Design a protein around this ligand. Structure first.
Ligand SMILES: Nc1ncnc2c1ncn2[C@@H]1O[C@H](C[C@@H](N)CC[C@H](N)C(=O)O)[C@@H](O)[C@H]1O
Length: 283
C-alpha cells in the first residue's frame, strides 16, 4: 500500500477533500455496526443524555454485536433499556437479558405510534439499520420509514442508515433529517454507506432535500475515500496496525468511556480493540 502521514482521519463525509471518477475480515459487518454505534452512543454519553434513555433499535436482527454494546454500558453503570425490533429472529446471544426486550415485528406507522405510547414520556434514542441489491425505490421507502420513525418516536437522538441512491439510478428528489454523516471504518471495500447522527434540539427535525447532483458528489467523494484514502498506511500512527481503517477506528474508540484505567491512551484503545475483536471472533 501507499504510505501517508496524517494527523487525523476523515470522521464525517464533509471532511473528504478530493474526488475520483467511480469505476476481507471475518464478520466485518458486525464490526462496522459495533464501532459506529459505540461512537454514536458514547457521544450521547458525553452529552449526558444517554443515562435514563431507552434505545429503540429497529432492524436489529441478527444483532450479534448488540450484546457487546449492552454489556459495555451495563458494566459502566449507565442505565439503559434496549428494545430491539425486527421481523427476523435475533442472535440467541441476546437471550436472557432483562434490560433487552426482543420484539419480532416489522414496524409500520401504526406500530410506531403504539411503542411511542408505551415508552412516553421517557427519552428515546433511535437506531435504524432497516433494509428491504436494493433498488432506489427500496432505499426511498426505507428512508421514508426512517423519517416516520423520527416524526412519531420523536427521539432525543438518532442514528440512521444513510446511503444516497446512485445518480444513474435516480428517481426523484427526497428528504432526510439534518445531522452529521459519520464515516464507517471496516465498511465494505467500496460501500458509500454512512450513518446520519442527529441530536434534536427543540425537537424540530428540519428536513433537507437530496438532489441528483448530491448523488454525484456522494459517489465521487466516497470512491476517492474507498479507492485512495482507505488503501493508505499511516506511517506516523503509533499502533500495531497502521492501515487507515485501524487509524480511523482508533479515533472513534478514544471517545469511548471505560471503567478500567490505563497507563496510556494507546493501551486503552489496544484493550478495546482486542475486546471487540475477541467477542466478534476476529483474529
Ligand atoms: N419495516 C421494518 N421493520 C423492522 N425491521 C425491518 C424492516 N424492514 C427491514 N427490516 C430488517 O432490517 C434488517 C436489515 C439488516 N441488514 C440489519 C442487521 C442488524 N442491524 C445487525 O446488527 O445484524 C433485516 O433483518 C430486516 O428484517
Amino acid at each position: 500500500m501507499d504510505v501517508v502521514s496524517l494527523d487525523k482521519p476523515f470522521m464525517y463525509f464533509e471532511e473528504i477533500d478530493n474526488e475520483l471518477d467511480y469505476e476481507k475480515l471475518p464478520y466485518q459487518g458486525q464490526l462496522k455496526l459495533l464501532l459506529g454505534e459505540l461512537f454514536f452512543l458514547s457521544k450521547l454519553q458525553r452529552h449526558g443524555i444517554l443515562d435514563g434513555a431507552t434505545v429503540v433499535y429497529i432492524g436489529s436482527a441478527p444483532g450479534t454485536h448488540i450484546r457487546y454494546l449492552r454489556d459495555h454500558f451495563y458494566n459502566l453503570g449507565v442505565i439503559i433499556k434496549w428494545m430491539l425490533i425486527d421481523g427476523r429472529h435475533h442472535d440467541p446471544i441476546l437471550n436472557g437479558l432483562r434490560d433487552v426486550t426482543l420484539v419480532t415485528r416489522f414496524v409500520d406507522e401504526e406500530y410506531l405510534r403504539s411503542i411511542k405510547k408505551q415508552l412516553h414520556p421517557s427519552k428515546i434514542i433511535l437506531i435504524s439499520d432497516v433494509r428491504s441489491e436494493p433498488s432506489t425505490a427500496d432505499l426511498l421507502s426505507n428512508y421514508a420509514l426512517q423519517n416516520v420513525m423520527i416524526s412519531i418516536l420523536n427521539p432525543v437522538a438518532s442514528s440512521l442508515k444513510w446511503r444516497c441512491p446512485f445518480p444513474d439510478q435516480w428517481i426523484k428528489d427526497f428528504y432526510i433529517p439534518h445531522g452529521n454523516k459519520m464515516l464507517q471504518p471496516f465498511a465494505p471495500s467500496y460501500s458509500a454507506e454512512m450513518r446520519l447522527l442527529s441530536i434534536y434540539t427543540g425537537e424540530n427535525m428540519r428536513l433537507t432535500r437530496v438532489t441528483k447532483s448530491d448523488a454525484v458528489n456522494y459517489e465521487k467523494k466516497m470512491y476517492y475515500l474507498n479507492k485512495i484514502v482507505r488503501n493508505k498506511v499511516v506511517i506516523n500512527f503509533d499502533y500495531p496496525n497502521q492501515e487507515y481503517d485501524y487509524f480511523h477506528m482508533y479515533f472513534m474508540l478514544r471517545t469511548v468511556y471505560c471503567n478500567k484505567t490505563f497507563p496510556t491512551t494507546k493501551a486503552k484503545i489496544l484493550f478495546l480493540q482486542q475486546s471487540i475483536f475477541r467477542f466478534l471472533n476476529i483474529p
